[PDB]
User: Fold this.
Amino acid sequence: FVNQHLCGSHLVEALYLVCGERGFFYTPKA
Amino acid sequence: FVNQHLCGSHLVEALYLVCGERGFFYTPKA
Amino acid sequence: FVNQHLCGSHLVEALYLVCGERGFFYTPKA
Amino acid sequence: FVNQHLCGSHLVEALYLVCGERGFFYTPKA
Amino acid sequence: FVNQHLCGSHLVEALYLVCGERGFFYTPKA
Amino acid sequence: FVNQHLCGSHLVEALYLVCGERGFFYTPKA
Amino acid sequence: GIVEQCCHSICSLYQVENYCN
Amino acid sequence: GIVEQCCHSICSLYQVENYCN
Amino acid sequence: GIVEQCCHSICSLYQVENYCN
Amino acid sequence: GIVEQCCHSICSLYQVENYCN
Amino acid sequence: GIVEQCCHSICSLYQVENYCN
Amino acid sequence: GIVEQCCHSICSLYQVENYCN
Ligand SMILES: [Cl-]
Ligand SMILES: [Cl-]
Ligand SMILES: [Zn+2]
Ligand SMILES: [Zn+2]
Assistant:
């Protein structure tokens, strides 16, 4: 797994791929 | 219809852009 | 809508999605 | 043929990369 | 099946995220 | 061609598009 | 859900926004 | 330009929309 | 337009460049 | 939040996974 | 290759990882 | 490497192409 800073849309894509069918929750306010 | 997996990638990017600080939940099959 | 810095390809994607069928114009020289 | 909306997203990213400082217009149906 | 070109774009992003510092080779048709 | 810094997934996408059928090799450790 | 409506048919940012929290 | 306005500074959906065709 | 040619068939960066300004 | 944890700092696959549904 | 397996069927990050170096 | 060359510094299409298979 990348060992770098994941920000903005990149973090959301990482969440999308890692979570899969489990789905995810994203709040930029934290 | 299209490949749901690829489409989803684009949907989450759109949610990131439009929702902003309100955040969002991504749940494929509620 | 995100309240953050939109740069590079991220700005272009934002333009693509916001403008839709209207299409857009992109010049990095400004 | 493919989903034009998704394809378009990839096309604008390609235009951003290749056109550079020349900028470009994205007009789906001239 | 889907448009292989678009799919590939998503595959390389996934490889970038998961492989990390191990790097990877992307060879469509070995 | 863009005359800007290409990093992370952006560099990988640039590699994907520029190399095409030739395929590419990516190692972040350099 | 958003997939059910936006993957078969094209959704504007307005339609996508309906799915925000 | 949209860069100085949206990349060098933070802009709104409305501001991004000023650059549509 | 670029959609008309590059979404049905695969376009190299060279073909995409044809559409730059 | 996932931002301060993964964007402001570097996080692992496991850490990203703590934010799944 | 990865295209052969992951473009027709959906691959988890685990399946994609199989293709790392 | 392509990073120090294209990310830490600005590189050309030709330079990016040196990293193709
Ligand atoms: Cl970035
Ligand atoms: Cl796609
Ligand atoms: Zn980025
Ligand atoms: Zn796509």
The two ends of chain B are 19 Å apart (CA to CA). Residues 1-30 of chain B form one domain. Residues 4-19 of chain B form the longest helix (16 residues). Chain B touches chain D at residues 2, 6-7, 10 (CB under 8 Å).
